[PDB]
From Swiss-Prot, chain A:
Transmembrane segments: none
Gene Ontology terms, MF aspect: protein homodimerization activity
Entries under Pfam families matching the protein: JAB (PF01398), MitMem_reg (PF13012)
Additional note from the record: Does not bind a metal ion.
Protein task: Component of the 26S proteasome, a multiprotein complex involved in the ATP-dependent degradation of ubiquitinated proteins. This complex plays a key role in the maintenance of protein homeostasis by removing misfolded or damaged proteins, which could impair cellular functions, and by removing proteins whose functions are no longer required. Therefore, the proteasome participates in numerous cellular processes, including cell cycle progression, apoptosis, or DNA damage repair.
Taxonomy, superkingdom: Eukaryota
Cross-link Glycyl lysine isopeptide (Lys-Gly) (interchain with G-Cter in ubiquitin), sequence positions: 176
Entry keyword annotation includes Ubl conjugation: yes
Domain MPN: from-to ranges: 5-140
The keyword Signal is assigned to this record: no
GO BP annotation list: proteasome-mediated ubiquitin-dependent protein catabolic process
SMART domains in UniProt: JAB_MPN
Protein's name in the database: 26S proteasome non-ATPase regulatory subunit 7
Swiss-Prot record, chain B:
Gene designation: PSMD11
Subunit and interaction comment: Component of the 19S proteasome regulatory particle complex. The 26S proteasome consists of a 20S core particle (CP) and two 19S regulatory subunits (RP). The regulatory particle is made of a lid composed of 9 subunits including PSMD11, a base containing 6 ATPases and few additional components.
Compartment(s) of residence: Nucleus; Cytoplasm, Cytosol
Residues of the full protein shown: 368 to 422 of 422
Protein name as catalogued: 26S proteasome non-ATPase regulatory subunit 11
UniProt note on tissues of expression: Highly expressed in embryonic stem cells (ESCs). Expression decreases as ESCs differentiate.
Domain of life: Eukaryota
UniProtKB/Swiss-Prot annotation, chain C:
Taxonomic source organism: Homo sapiens
Protein name as catalogued: 26S proteasome non-ATPase regulatory subunit 14
Subunit structure: Component of the 19S proteasome regulatory particle complex. The 26S proteasome consists of a 20S core particle (CP) and two 19S regulatory subunits (RP). The regulatory particle is made of a lid composed of 9 subunits including PSMD4, a base containing 6 ATPases and few additional components. Within the complex, PSMD4 interacts with subunit PSMD7 through their respective MPN domain. Interacts with TXNL1.
Protein's job: Component of the 26S proteasome, a multiprotein complex involved in the ATP-dependent degradation of ubiquitinated proteins. This complex plays a key role in the maintenance of protein homeostasis by removing misfolded or damaged proteins, which could impair cellular functions, and by removing proteins whose functions are no longer required. Therefore, the proteasome participates in numerous cellular processes, including cell cycle progression, apoptosis, or DNA damage repair.
Name of the gene: PSMD14
Whole-protein residues included: 197 to 253 of 310
Record-listed Phosphoserine modification sites: 28
Organ and tissue specificity: Widely expressed. Highest levels in heart and skeletal muscle.
Length: 286, 55, 57
Protein backbone atom coordinates (compact mmCIF):
# COMPACT_ATOMS: atom_id res chain seq x y z
CA UNK A 1 0.00 0.00 0.00
CA UNK A 2 2.57 2.55 1.19
CA UNK A 3 6.03 2.36 -0.38
CA UNK A 4 7.85 5.04 1.63
CA UNK A 5 7.21 7.58 4.39
CA UNK A 6 8.54 11.05 5.19
CA UNK A 7 9.35 11.93 8.81
CA UNK A 8 10.25 15.50 9.73
CA UNK A 9 12.83 16.08 12.51
CA UNK A 10 10.21 18.08 14.45
CA UNK A 11 8.76 14.91 16.00
CA UNK A 12 12.21 13.61 16.96
CA UNK A 13 13.03 16.95 18.57
CA UNK A 14 9.69 16.47 20.30
CA UNK A 15 11.28 13.25 21.56
CA UNK A 16 14.16 15.45 22.74
CA UNK A 17 11.40 17.27 24.62
CA UNK A 18 10.20 13.86 25.85
CA UNK A 19 13.70 13.52 27.33
CA UNK A 20 13.66 17.13 28.57
CA UNK A 21 10.38 17.30 30.53
CA UNK A 22 11.09 14.05 32.43
CA UNK A 23 11.87 15.91 35.65
CA UNK A 24 14.58 13.54 36.97
CA UNK A 25 12.22 10.98 38.48
CA UNK A 26 14.02 7.75 37.53
CA UNK A 27 11.51 6.06 35.18
CA UNK A 28 12.58 6.90 31.58
CA UNK A 29 10.31 4.21 30.16
CA UNK A 30 8.97 3.93 26.59
CA UNK A 31 6.85 7.08 26.59
CA UNK A 32 4.29 6.67 23.80
CA UNK A 33 3.51 9.72 21.67
CA UNK A 34 0.57 10.20 19.31
CA UNK A 35 2.11 10.42 15.83
CA UNK A 36 0.35 12.73 13.37
CA UNK A 37 0.66 12.94 9.61
CA UNK A 38 -1.07 13.04 6.24
CA UNK A 39 -2.55 9.66 5.30
CA UNK A 40 -4.40 11.14 2.29
CA UNK A 41 -1.60 10.75 -0.25
CA UNK A 42 0.12 7.42 -0.86
CA UNK A 43 3.29 8.79 0.76
CA UNK A 44 3.20 9.51 4.50
CA UNK A 45 4.33 12.96 5.67
CA UNK A 46 4.71 13.69 9.39
CA UNK A 47 4.44 17.39 10.21
CA UNK A 48 4.09 17.49 14.01
CA UNK A 49 2.85 15.33 16.89
CA UNK A 50 2.05 15.34 20.60
CA UNK A 51 2.18 12.97 23.57
CA UNK A 52 -0.14 11.23 26.04
CA UNK A 53 0.69 10.11 29.62
CA UNK A 54 1.74 6.47 29.20
CA UNK A 55 2.77 4.26 32.13
CA UNK A 56 3.38 0.50 32.29
CA UNK A 57 3.99 -2.00 35.08
CA UNK A 58 7.36 -3.22 36.30
CA UNK A 59 6.73 -6.98 36.26
CA UNK A 60 3.62 -7.43 34.10
CA UNK A 61 4.20 -6.33 30.51
CA UNK A 62 0.53 -6.49 29.47
CA UNK A 63 -0.21 -3.30 31.46
CA UNK A 64 -0.66 -0.21 29.27
CA UNK A 65 -2.34 3.11 30.05
CA UNK A 66 -3.76 5.38 27.34
CA UNK A 67 -6.38 8.14 27.23
CA UNK A 68 -9.30 8.74 24.87
CA UNK A 69 -10.49 12.12 26.18
CA UNK A 70 -7.00 13.62 25.98
CA UNK A 71 -6.59 12.24 22.45
CA UNK A 72 -9.94 13.62 21.30
CA UNK A 73 -9.29 16.99 22.99
CA UNK A 74 -5.71 17.49 21.78
CA UNK A 75 -6.70 16.13 18.36
CA UNK A 76 -9.88 18.21 18.37
CA UNK A 77 -8.10 21.47 19.20
CA UNK A 78 -5.20 20.62 16.88
CA UNK A 79 -7.72 19.93 14.11
CA UNK A 80 -9.45 23.21 14.96
CA UNK A 81 -6.21 25.16 14.55
CA UNK A 82 -4.93 23.01 11.65
CA UNK A 83 -7.38 20.73 9.82
CA UNK A 84 -4.87 19.71 7.13
CA UNK A 85 -3.33 17.03 9.38
CA UNK A 86 -5.11 14.12 11.07
CA UNK A 87 -4.29 11.12 13.24
CA UNK A 88 -2.23 8.36 11.61
CA UNK A 89 -0.48 6.35 14.33
CA UNK A 90 1.89 6.42 17.29
CA UNK A 91 5.50 5.73 18.26
CA UNK A 92 7.49 4.61 21.30
CA UNK A 93 11.03 5.53 22.31
CA UNK A 94 11.93 2.05 23.56
CA UNK A 95 14.72 0.23 21.72
CA UNK A 96 13.07 -3.19 22.14
CA UNK A 97 9.77 -4.37 20.67
CA UNK A 98 7.67 -5.71 23.55
CA UNK A 99 4.72 -8.08 23.28
CA UNK A 100 2.25 -5.48 24.62
CA UNK A 101 2.73 -3.35 21.48
CA UNK A 102 0.04 -5.40 19.72
CA UNK A 103 -2.46 -4.33 22.39
CA UNK A 104 -1.19 -0.74 22.47
CA UNK A 105 -1.36 -0.52 18.68
CA UNK A 106 -4.66 -2.42 18.61
CA UNK A 107 -6.50 0.53 20.19
CA UNK A 108 -5.40 2.87 17.40
CA UNK A 109 -6.18 0.08 14.94
CA UNK A 110 -9.79 -0.04 16.17
CA UNK A 111 -10.47 3.67 16.68
CA UNK A 112 -7.98 5.11 14.18
CA UNK A 113 -6.99 3.75 10.75
CA UNK A 114 -3.99 1.47 10.11
CA UNK A 115 -1.26 2.89 12.35
CA UNK A 116 2.43 2.92 11.44
CA UNK A 117 4.95 2.11 14.17
CA UNK A 118 8.34 3.79 14.66
CA UNK A 119 11.06 2.36 16.92
CA UNK A 120 13.81 4.77 17.99
CA UNK A 121 16.60 4.79 20.58
CA UNK A 122 16.68 6.59 23.92
CA UNK A 123 20.38 7.41 23.43
CA UNK A 124 21.53 8.82 20.06
CA UNK A 125 24.56 6.51 20.01
CA UNK A 126 23.30 4.39 17.10
CA UNK A 127 25.04 5.43 13.89
CA UNK A 128 22.22 4.04 11.74
CA UNK A 129 18.98 5.78 10.87
CA UNK A 130 16.95 6.12 14.11
CA UNK A 131 13.55 5.99 12.36
CA UNK A 132 12.07 2.71 11.11
CA UNK A 133 8.52 2.70 9.74
CA UNK A 134 6.76 -0.54 10.74
CA UNK A 135 3.35 -1.00 9.12
CA UNK A 136 0.69 -2.76 11.21
CA UNK A 137 -0.73 -5.32 8.78
CA UNK A 138 -1.61 -8.99 9.15
CA UNK A 139 0.23 -11.34 6.79
CA UNK A 140 -0.38 -14.98 5.92
CA UNK A 141 2.47 -17.29 6.93
CA UNK A 142 3.47 -20.34 4.91
CA UNK A 143 4.36 -22.56 7.89
CA UNK A 144 0.73 -22.55 9.07
CA UNK A 145 1.05 -20.32 12.13
CA UNK A 146 -2.15 -18.39 12.96
CA UNK A 147 -2.50 -14.94 11.44
CA UNK A 148 -1.15 -12.24 13.75
CA UNK A 149 -0.02 -8.62 13.59
CA UNK A 150 3.24 -8.32 11.65
CA UNK A 151 5.53 -5.27 11.62
CA UNK A 152 7.08 -5.00 8.15
CA UNK A 153 9.89 -2.49 7.71
CA UNK A 154 8.93 0.44 5.47
CA UNK A 155 11.74 2.67 4.22
CA UNK A 156 11.87 6.19 5.64
CA UNK A 157 13.62 9.48 4.86
CA UNK A 158 14.32 12.51 7.05
CA UNK A 159 13.57 15.69 5.12
CA UNK A 160 12.31 19.21 5.78
CA UNK A 161 10.14 21.15 3.36
CA UNK A 162 10.68 24.91 3.73
CA UNK A 163 11.72 26.25 7.14
CA UNK A 164 13.16 23.44 9.28
CA UNK A 165 16.20 23.23 6.99
CA UNK A 166 16.88 26.92 7.65
CA UNK A 167 16.30 26.60 11.39
CA UNK A 168 18.50 23.51 11.69
CA UNK A 169 21.22 25.07 9.53
CA UNK A 170 21.19 28.24 11.65
CA UNK A 171 21.12 26.40 14.99
CA UNK A 172 23.98 24.08 14.02
CA UNK A 173 26.44 26.35 12.15
CA UNK A 174 28.76 23.30 12.15
CA UNK A 175 27.30 20.88 9.59
CA UNK A 176 28.25 21.39 5.94
CA UNK A 177 26.11 21.24 2.81
CA UNK A 178 26.53 18.80 -0.09
CA UNK A 179 29.79 20.46 -1.23
CA UNK A 180 30.76 18.03 -3.97
CA UNK A 181 34.52 17.65 -4.30
CA UNK A 182 37.35 16.41 -2.10
CA UNK A 183 36.25 16.59 1.54
CA UNK A 184 32.60 15.52 1.41
CA UNK A 185 33.53 12.58 -0.83
CA UNK A 186 36.66 11.39 1.00
CA UNK A 187 34.94 11.55 4.40
CA UNK A 188 32.24 9.16 3.16
CA UNK A 189 34.92 7.02 1.50
CA UNK A 190 36.82 6.85 4.81
CA UNK A 191 34.05 6.32 7.38
CA UNK A 192 31.76 4.22 5.15
CA UNK A 193 33.65 1.05 6.06
CA UNK A 194 32.84 1.72 9.71
CA UNK A 195 29.27 2.62 8.72
CA UNK A 196 28.86 -0.91 7.36
CA UNK A 197 31.24 -2.47 9.87
CA UNK A 198 29.23 -1.44 12.94
CA UNK A 199 25.96 -2.57 11.33
CA UNK A 200 27.09 -5.94 9.97
CA UNK A 201 29.42 -6.63 12.91
CA UNK A 202 26.67 -5.56 15.32
CA UNK A 203 24.09 -7.83 13.64
CA UNK A 204 25.89 -11.06 12.69
CA UNK A 205 27.13 -11.64 16.25
CA UNK A 206 23.66 -11.86 17.80
CA UNK A 207 22.56 -13.57 14.58
CA UNK A 208 25.17 -16.32 14.94
CA UNK A 209 24.24 -16.49 18.63
CA UNK A 210 20.57 -17.09 17.79
CA UNK A 211 21.57 -19.67 15.15
CA UNK A 212 22.67 -22.26 17.72
CA UNK A 213 21.02 -20.80 20.85
CA UNK A 214 17.70 -19.95 19.18
CA UNK A 215 14.15 -21.27 19.52
CA UNK A 216 10.61 -19.84 19.34
CA UNK A 217 10.71 -19.77 15.51
CA UNK A 218 12.42 -16.58 14.32
CA UNK A 219 11.13 -17.12 10.77
CA UNK A 220 13.99 -19.38 9.68
CA UNK A 221 12.37 -19.38 6.22
CA UNK A 222 13.82 -15.94 5.43
CA UNK A 223 17.29 -17.20 6.39
CA UNK A 224 17.33 -19.30 3.21
CA UNK A 225 16.82 -16.13 1.17
CA UNK A 226 19.43 -14.41 3.35
CA UNK A 227 22.18 -16.95 2.66
CA UNK A 228 20.87 -17.28 -0.90
CA UNK A 229 21.39 -13.59 -1.71
CA UNK A 230 24.69 -13.79 0.18
CA UNK A 231 25.64 -16.65 -2.16
CA UNK A 232 24.47 -14.76 -5.26
CA UNK A 233 28.01 -13.34 -5.54
CA UNK A 234 30.20 -16.48 -5.48
CA UNK A 235 33.55 -14.67 -5.83
CA UNK A 236 33.42 -13.85 -9.54
CA UNK A 237 36.72 -14.61 -11.29
CA UNK A 238 36.71 -11.07 -12.79
CA UNK A 239 37.53 -12.54 -16.22
CA UNK A 240 34.75 -10.73 -18.09
CA UNK A 241 35.13 -7.50 -16.09
CA UNK A 242 38.75 -6.99 -17.22
CA UNK A 243 37.58 -4.91 -20.18
CA UNK A 244 35.40 -2.95 -17.75
CA UNK A 245 38.56 -2.21 -15.76
CA UNK A 246 40.05 -1.05 -19.07
CA UNK A 247 37.07 1.28 -19.55
CA UNK A 248 37.08 2.72 -16.02
CA UNK A 249 40.88 2.92 -16.13
CA UNK A 250 40.64 4.65 -19.51
CA UNK A 251 38.34 7.22 -17.91
CA UNK A 252 41.03 7.41 -15.23
CA UNK A 253 43.48 8.25 -18.03
CA UNK A 254 41.05 10.94 -19.20
CA UNK A 255 41.10 12.44 -15.71
CA UNK A 256 44.91 12.24 -15.84
CA UNK A 257 45.05 14.24 -19.07
CA UNK A 258 42.48 16.73 -17.78
CA UNK A 259 44.36 17.27 -14.51
CA UNK A 260 47.83 17.54 -16.07
CA UNK A 261 46.72 19.69 -19.01
CA UNK A 262 44.36 21.99 -17.10
CA UNK A 263 46.80 22.47 -14.21
CA UNK A 264 49.47 23.15 -16.84
CA UNK A 265 47.16 25.91 -18.09
CA UNK A 266 46.79 27.24 -14.54
CA UNK A 267 50.60 27.41 -14.26
CA UNK A 268 50.59 30.21 -16.87
CA UNK A 269 49.56 33.18 -14.72
CA UNK A 270 51.61 31.97 -11.75
CA UNK A 271 54.80 31.17 -13.68
CA UNK A 272 54.50 34.49 -15.54
CA UNK A 273 53.53 36.88 -12.73
CA UNK A 274 56.24 35.35 -10.53
CA UNK A 275 58.83 36.75 -12.97
CA UNK A 276 57.26 39.91 -14.40
CA UNK A 277 56.16 41.10 -10.95
CA UNK A 278 59.35 40.29 -9.02
CA UNK A 279 61.83 41.62 -11.58
CA UNK A 280 59.85 44.83 -12.22
CA UNK A 281 59.15 45.50 -8.54
CA UNK A 282 62.84 44.83 -7.84
CA UNK A 283 64.16 46.98 -10.70
CA UNK A 284 61.70 49.77 -9.81
CA UNK A 285 62.00 49.53 -6.01
CA UNK A 286 65.10 51.73 -5.94
CA UNK B 1 31.48 -0.24 -50.17
CA UNK B 2 33.49 -1.00 -47.02
CA UNK B 3 36.11 1.38 -48.42
CA UNK B 4 33.16 3.78 -48.76
CA UNK B 5 32.30 3.13 -45.08
CA UNK B 6 28.56 2.69 -45.60
CA UNK B 7 28.37 -0.06 -42.96
CA UNK B 8 30.54 -2.07 -40.56
CA UNK B 9 32.26 -5.09 -42.07
CA UNK B 10 35.43 -6.53 -43.55
CA UNK B 11 36.01 -9.24 -46.14
CA UNK B 12 38.51 -12.09 -46.37
CA UNK B 13 40.10 -14.25 -49.07
CA UNK B 14 41.99 -17.04 -47.31
CA UNK B 15 39.30 -17.94 -44.77
CA UNK B 16 36.33 -15.83 -45.88
CA UNK B 17 35.56 -14.76 -42.30
CA UNK B 18 33.19 -11.81 -41.90
CA UNK B 19 33.60 -9.58 -38.83
CA UNK B 20 31.32 -6.67 -37.90
CA UNK B 21 32.32 -4.22 -35.17
CA UNK B 22 31.92 -0.57 -34.22
CA UNK B 23 33.51 2.05 -31.95
CA UNK B 24 30.84 4.18 -30.24
CA UNK B 25 33.00 6.51 -28.09
CA UNK B 26 34.23 8.76 -30.89
CA UNK B 27 33.74 12.07 -29.04
CA UNK B 28 36.41 11.29 -26.42
CA UNK B 29 39.63 11.13 -28.45
CA UNK B 30 38.53 14.07 -30.60
CA UNK B 31 37.99 16.44 -27.67
CA UNK B 32 41.08 15.12 -25.87
CA UNK B 33 43.33 15.47 -28.92
CA UNK B 34 41.94 18.96 -29.57
CA UNK B 35 42.70 19.90 -25.96
CA UNK B 36 46.27 18.63 -26.36
CA UNK B 37 46.81 20.46 -29.66
CA UNK B 38 45.26 23.67 -28.31
CA UNK B 39 47.32 23.44 -25.10
CA UNK B 40 50.54 22.97 -27.08
CA UNK B 41 50.13 26.55 -28.30
CA UNK B 42 49.51 27.62 -24.70
CA UNK B 43 52.73 26.10 -23.35
CA UNK B 44 54.72 27.24 -26.39
CA UNK B 45 53.39 30.79 -26.05
CA UNK B 46 54.26 30.64 -22.34
CA UNK B 47 57.82 29.67 -23.30
CA UNK B 48 57.77 32.60 -25.74
CA UNK B 49 56.78 35.08 -23.03
CA UNK B 50 59.30 33.68 -20.54
CA UNK B 51 62.01 33.29 -23.18
CA UNK B 52 61.28 36.89 -24.17
CA UNK B 53 61.41 38.24 -20.61
CA UNK B 54 64.54 36.25 -19.64
CA UNK B 55 66.82 36.21 -22.70
CA UNK C 1 12.08 53.46 17.97
CA UNK C 2 10.28 56.05 20.11
CA UNK C 3 8.28 54.29 22.86
CA UNK C 4 9.19 50.97 21.17
CA UNK C 5 12.53 49.21 21.75
CA UNK C 6 13.85 45.65 21.49
CA UNK C 7 15.99 43.11 23.35
CA UNK C 8 18.86 40.77 22.51
CA UNK C 9 18.38 37.09 21.68
CA UNK C 10 20.70 34.16 22.41
CA UNK C 11 20.38 30.39 21.95
CA UNK C 12 21.18 27.26 23.94
CA UNK C 13 21.88 23.65 22.93
CA UNK C 14 22.67 20.65 25.13
CA UNK C 15 24.55 17.52 24.06
CA UNK C 16 21.35 15.56 23.38
CA UNK C 17 20.14 18.12 20.84
CA UNK C 18 23.69 18.45 19.48
CA UNK C 19 24.27 14.75 18.83
CA UNK C 20 20.64 13.81 18.11
CA UNK C 21 20.04 16.73 15.74
CA UNK C 22 23.58 16.66 14.34
CA UNK C 23 23.56 12.93 13.61
CA UNK C 24 19.93 13.32 12.51
CA UNK C 25 20.90 15.95 9.93
CA UNK C 26 24.00 14.08 8.76
CA UNK C 27 21.78 11.01 8.39
CA UNK C 28 19.26 13.28 6.66
CA UNK C 29 22.02 13.90 4.10
CA UNK C 30 23.22 10.26 4.20
CA UNK C 31 21.70 6.97 3.06
CA UNK C 32 19.91 4.21 4.95
CA UNK C 33 22.69 1.62 5.00
CA UNK C 34 25.11 4.32 3.73
CA UNK C 35 26.40 1.86 1.11
CA UNK C 36 23.44 1.98 -1.31
CA UNK C 37 23.91 5.09 -3.46
CA UNK C 38 27.72 4.82 -3.65
CA UNK C 39 27.89 2.17 -6.39
CA UNK C 40 25.08 4.06 -8.14
CA UNK C 41 27.46 6.93 -8.91
CA UNK C 42 30.50 4.64 -9.15
CA UNK C 43 28.75 2.87 -12.05
CA UNK C 44 27.05 6.03 -13.34
CA UNK C 45 30.53 7.41 -14.01
CA UNK C 46 30.56 5.08 -17.03
CA UNK C 47 27.04 5.85 -18.31
CA UNK C 48 25.85 9.35 -17.32
CA UNK C 49 28.95 11.22 -16.12
CA UNK C 50 30.64 10.50 -19.47
CA UNK C 51 28.21 13.01 -20.98
CA UNK C 52 29.14 15.47 -18.22
CA UNK C 53 32.82 14.79 -18.93
CA UNK C 54 32.40 15.40 -22.66
CA UNK C 55 30.41 18.58 -21.99
CA UNK C 56 33.01 19.52 -19.38
CA UNK C 57 35.68 19.20 -22.07
Amino acid sequence: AVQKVVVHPLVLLSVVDHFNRIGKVGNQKRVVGVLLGSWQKKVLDVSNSFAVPFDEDDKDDSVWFLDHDYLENMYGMFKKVNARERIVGWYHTGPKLHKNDIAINELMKRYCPNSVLVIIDVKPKDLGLPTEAYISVEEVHDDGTPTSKTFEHVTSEIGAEEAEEVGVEHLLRDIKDTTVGTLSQRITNQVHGLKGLNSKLLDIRSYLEKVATGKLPINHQIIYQLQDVFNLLPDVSLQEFVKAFYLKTNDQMVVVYLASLIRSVVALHNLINNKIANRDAEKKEG
Amino acid sequence: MILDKKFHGILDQGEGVLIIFDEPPVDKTYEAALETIQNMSKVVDSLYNKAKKLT
Amino acid sequence: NRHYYSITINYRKNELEQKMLLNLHKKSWMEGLTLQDYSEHCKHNESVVKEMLELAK
